[PDB]
Every structure is written in C-alpha cells, then in structure tokens.
Design a protein around this ligand. Structure first.
Ligand code: NA
Ligand code: NA
Ligand code: NA
Ligand code: NA
Length: 327
DNA sequence: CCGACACCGCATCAGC
DNA sequence: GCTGATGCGT
DNA sequence: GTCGG
C-alpha cells in the first residue's frame, strides 16, 4: 500500500480526468479507463519518473503516458487546468455528487442556471424524490462509516429481522464482511426458506419493522426484491446525532443466496479471479448461480448451493475467508 | 481497424 | 391506460 | 482511453 506521496499527483490527476469523462463528456468507458490507470499506478511501489515507465503497466496507454510526461515536467496538465476553471463543466461535475443526480440531470440543471446546492435548495419543485433526499443528506452521504458504527447498525438489522421471522437469514456484505475498518454504506442480503427461484411481502415486512423502530428514516426506492434507503443509529440523549447512512436491502431466492453473498462480498478483484478460475474448471459463476460448461460450451442447469463453500468445492479452491478475499 | 468495456431493479420518462 | 426505453445506482 | 481479436 504505497503512500500517496509516491505518485499521488499522477493518481489525483487521472481520477479528476476520470470524473469529467463520466460526468461532463458522458464517456463512461473513458471514465473507467482513467480509473483503471489510476488504480494500477496507485499500487505501483515506485515513484514514476516518466510516461514510458508508466506505460509498462496494464491500463496505461499512449495518451496517459503523454499526460504523465506533461505533469512530471510542469506539475500540471493544461487540459485539466482549463476545465477546472470552466464554470459550466465544474458545475455539472459537482452536481453529480448529489445522489440521484447523474450526468443527464446535472447537465439539464446547469443548462437552466442551477449550478449550486443553494440553487438546488431553491428549486425543490425541479427535483424528484431521490434527488431531494440526496440533497437533504449531501454531507452525511459523503462521510464514511466507522466499523464500530457498522457493528451497531448490524446489531439492529439482525435483531429486527429475526424479530419479524426467526427463519429469515440476513448477511451484511461488502467490504465490511471482509473486515474493512470503514464502509461507505450498508449492504444487506436477505433470504427466507419460503422463497426460491421456482416458487412464489417478505422484503416489505422487514423494511417496515426497521421503520417502526425508527432505524430506517427515508426510502429512495423499494420494490419486491430491492430496497434502497437511509438509516440512522439512535443518538444518546445529549450526544451529537449520528450521520444518516445509506442502506440497501436485497431479497434473494434461497437457492441463489450464497452466490449472492459471495458476489456482494467481493472484492471486485477476487470476483474476477474466482470467476476466471471457475471457467477453466468447466464452470460459469455469476451473481445468481454456478453452472457446468459442456465440451462445446453449452451451460447446464445451475448446481445446488447451500453455502459459500459449496461454490468453492465445485471449482476446486479451498474456502477462503472473507478477510482474505482482497484479491 | 474497430468492438468491448456487466447485468439488472426501480423510478420515471417517451411513445403510443 | 400500457409497454418499452432511459437515467441512476449498486 | 486501452486493450486485443
Ligand atoms: Na500499458
Ligand atoms: Na449523483
Ligand atoms: Na456521484
Ligand atoms: Na419463529
């Protein structure tokens, strides 16, 4: 985990570029290209001396190598400096930081003169439900969640779920499950023996109880299988109130639950490699199932999975702890 | 050279 | 009103 | 923007 001081200037630059591609130029693939470049460089255990050196890293190509050369010789990048001062682009880029406001909404807003949160605040009528909530908790949503708070949050979630029906199975996934010391939000995977792929309010009852005890404070979206909202830990009489947090709850069929827990636990890298290894072993693993691949490439019916290990067993790969799934 | 870069639930829009 | 497409987010 | 069939 090389200190940012190594190539932080370079990594910051690529990430800033990444954001403008995504939020202003609406070029999602260039956005991911810059992210990938910044990721590989952020991991590089050496202070980069030239673009040629960086180009050796997978994800860093001709254009980025050239930009690195400019940054190393001048300490900046003309194209980035210019776009920072651009009132329109900087505003569009900024507005996307509000949950619910994507590249399209941000452009539409800036086009009609709405460029700041203050502007947004004065124009509630132009915001949909999600966006109003995103505006309401703008600061809180950008704050991270200490593991200690994630544990208290888990305590409430697991308690209320069991209270609704002791047969529910709930698992808080994400980096939190891998042992991370901080999380950006809470991702809860829920299932019930009564719910399977080929079988016929399970989610509603849980969301409702969480609201009843005033843990869940707002709802961004809610259907029969996925809830996205806001929650807040109860504050101690006198204590500063805790920040509002983003929490998602997904109801998944029992027979596909562990493939789900596996995937949403990550990391994104571990998923890539495991899915790779699975292929060569003659298996295709996605978010919902693991299936065998015949000699001509024809996928067969999904294999029974009753635990994460079952998945690991199928592809000959000793079960690895979540704490060791960094890659 | 030029297509891939993931799949999908929900809220909401666009077209009929 | 219904159906499909789009925006957004994870 | 980068990769690769
Ligand atoms: Na490269
Ligand atoms: Na946003
Ligand atoms: Na954003
Ligand atoms: Na019971």
């Amino acid at each position: 985990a090389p200190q940012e001081t190594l190539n932080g200037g370079i990594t910051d630059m690529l990430t800033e570029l990444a954001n403008f591609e995504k939020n202003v130029s609406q070029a999602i693939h260039k956005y991911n290209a810059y992210r990938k470049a910044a990721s590989v460089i952020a991991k590089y255990p050496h202070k980069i001396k030239s673009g040629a050196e960086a180009k050796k890293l997978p994800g860093v190509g001709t254009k980025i190598a050239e930009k690195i050369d400019e940054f190393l010789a001048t300490g900046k990048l003309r194209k980035l400096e210019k776009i920072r001062q651009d009132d329109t682009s900087s505003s569009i880029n900024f507005l996307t930081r509000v949950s619910g406001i994507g590249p399209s909404a941000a452009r539409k807003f800036v086009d009609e003169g709405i460029k700041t949160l203050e502007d947004l605040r004065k124009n509630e009528d132009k915001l949909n439900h999600h966006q109003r909530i995103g505006l309401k908790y703008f600061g809180d949503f950008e704050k991270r969640i200490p593991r200690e708070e994630m544990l208290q949050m888990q305590d409430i979630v697991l308690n209320e779920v069991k209270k609704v029906d002791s047969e529910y199975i709930a698992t808080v996934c994400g980096s939190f499950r891998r042992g991370a010391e901080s999380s950006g939000d809470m991702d809860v995977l829920l299932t019930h023996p009564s719910f399977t792929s080929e079988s016929t309010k399970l989610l509603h009852q849980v969301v409702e109880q969480l609201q009843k005890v005033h843990f869940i404070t707002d709802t961004l979206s809610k259907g029969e299988t996925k809830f996205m909202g806001v929650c807040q830990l109860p504050s101690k009489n006198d204590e500063k109130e805790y920040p509002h947090r983003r929490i998602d709850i997904r109801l998944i069929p029992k027979d596909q639950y562990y493939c789900g827990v596996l995937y949403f636990t990550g990391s994104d890298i571990f998923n890539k490699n495991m899915r790779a290894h699975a292929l060569e072993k003659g298996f295709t693993i996605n978010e919902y199932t693991i299936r065998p691949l015949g000699v001509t490439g024809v996928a067969g019916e999904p294999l029974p999975v009753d635990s994460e290990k079952d998945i690991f067993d199928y592809i000959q790969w000793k079960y690895r702890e979540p704490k060791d799934r960094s890659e």
